[PDB]
């Protein structure tokens, strides 16, 4: 049995501190990340969000009449039916989007679960994943966050998953206000799309706890 040991650095996030120690055992890690699964999950996530509102009018749905513009023979002109025909510039298209549909589909649970798992592994081994005990934002201002990201040399895009959404106003207020770099989201609302959207992941101890619980229970349910 190979046990992966990951070091969790506790940051009191005031300033000038990279010092912290916690021993983490992320059994959720996978040997080789699947690109195919991740791609399918991304494509699917892009797929069920489609509104499918594209509309047109077939020749039958055209306001124009179905009367014959002239006689079949003797006129000297070409043979023609109603002017709502697609061959006419007053008509529509037959193969057009007009008929509606739904571009989504039902993806197996093990596939999407293994997708989030593999993605988490990718972010893990990429050094872009950091674990903390807690989060503190006493001053709660954009300048503090920016200078923190610049001084601590974090990633260009960092996804912060900490809160259970039920507490800690001081953080959320400053974090959700006018910030392009950092994004916020509850621990129970963590998804693969959000992780792949950002180049850097930062999780806290409860977040990692619930995450590893959910992922170990899903891996144990998929193995059994």
């Amino acid at each position: 049995x190979x046990x992966x040991x990951x070091x969790x650095x506790x940051x009191x996030x005031x300033x000038x501190x990279x010092x912290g120690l916690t021993e983490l055992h992320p059994d959720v890690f996978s040997t080789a990340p699947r690109l195919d699964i991740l791609h399918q999950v991304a494509i699917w996530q892009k797929n069920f969000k489609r509104i499918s509102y594209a509309k047109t009018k077939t020749r039958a749905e055209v306001r124009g009449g179905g009367r014959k513009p002239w006689v079949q023979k003797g006129s000297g002109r070409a043979r023609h039916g109603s002017i709502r025909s697609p061959i006419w510039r007053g008509g529509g298209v037959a193969h057009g989007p007009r008929g509606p549909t739904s571009y989504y589909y039902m993806l197996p649970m093990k596939v999407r679960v293994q997708g989030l798992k593999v993605a988490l592994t990718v972010k893990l081994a990429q050094d872009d994943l950091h674990i903390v005990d807690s989060l503190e934002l006493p001053t709660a201002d954009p300048q503090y966050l920016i200078e923190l990201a610049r001084y601590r040399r974090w990633g260009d895009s960092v996804l912060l998953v900490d809160l259970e959404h039920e507490d800690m106003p001081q953080n959320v207020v400053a974090a959700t206000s006018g910030l392009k770099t950092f994004n916020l989201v509850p621990a129970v609302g963590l998804n693969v799309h959000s992780m792949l959207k950002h180049q850097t992941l930062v999780l806290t101890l409860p977040t990692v706890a619930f995450l590893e619980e959910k992922l170990x229970x899903x891996x144990x349910x998929x193995x059994x």
């Binding site: 890690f29 996978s30 040997t31 080789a32 990340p33 690109l35 195919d36 991740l38 791609h39 991304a42 990718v122 081994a125 990429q126 872009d128 792949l196 180049q199």
Partner: protein
């Protein structure tokens, strides 16, 4: 081995632009436009095959159809009113015993067999019975009670031989 080789080199961090499918994952859908197959889109020259009005399937071209020359039997008559019974092998049972499932007599029943994912769902089967066809019964484990609708002779034999109890309902 692949984890160490992927962690050793510094990659592009795998942006969404770096996502690529495995070889042969998705087919490069063929478009009829081209000089590859001229103007017929693979329908050939004329005929009724070209038209979308082409004849329906199950048609031999006006000669007497294949199914019309075949006599009739009660094969289909069965699938309606037949009394459904599902055979179960003793090998599956002893396998369940070897899987570390529930040992004692009292809790054992068809419901527990349902929870163990070892049963076949019969939604379209009316009046569903349960039967046991003998197999894999050689030197199988002992002291196990089984309650079924109707058990075959060799099933009751095999079960009772090792000290098991056969419950017929």
């Amino acid at each position: 081995x692949x984890x160490x080789x992927x962690x050793x080199x510094x990659x592009x961090x795998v942006s969404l632009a770096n996502l690529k499918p495995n070889p042969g994952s998705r087919k490069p859908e063929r478009r009829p436009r081209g000089r590859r197959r001229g103007r017929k889109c693979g329908r050939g020259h004329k005929g009724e095959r070209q038209r979308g009005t082409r004849p329906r399937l199950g048609f031999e071209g006006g000669q007497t159809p294949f199914y019309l020359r075949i006599p009739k039997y009660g094969f289909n008559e069965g699938h309606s009113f037949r009394h459904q019974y599902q055979p179960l092998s003793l090998n599956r049972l002893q396998y369940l015993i070897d899987l570390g499932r529930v040992d004692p007599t009292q809790p054992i029943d068809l419901t527990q067999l349902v929870n163990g994912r070892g049963v076949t769902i019969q939604p379209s089967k009316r009046d569903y019975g349960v039967q046991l066809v003998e197999e894999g019964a050689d030197t199988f484990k002992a002291k196990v009670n089984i309650e079924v609708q109707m058990a075959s002779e060799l099933a009751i034999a095999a079960i009772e031989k090792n000290g098991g109890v056969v419950t017929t309902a």
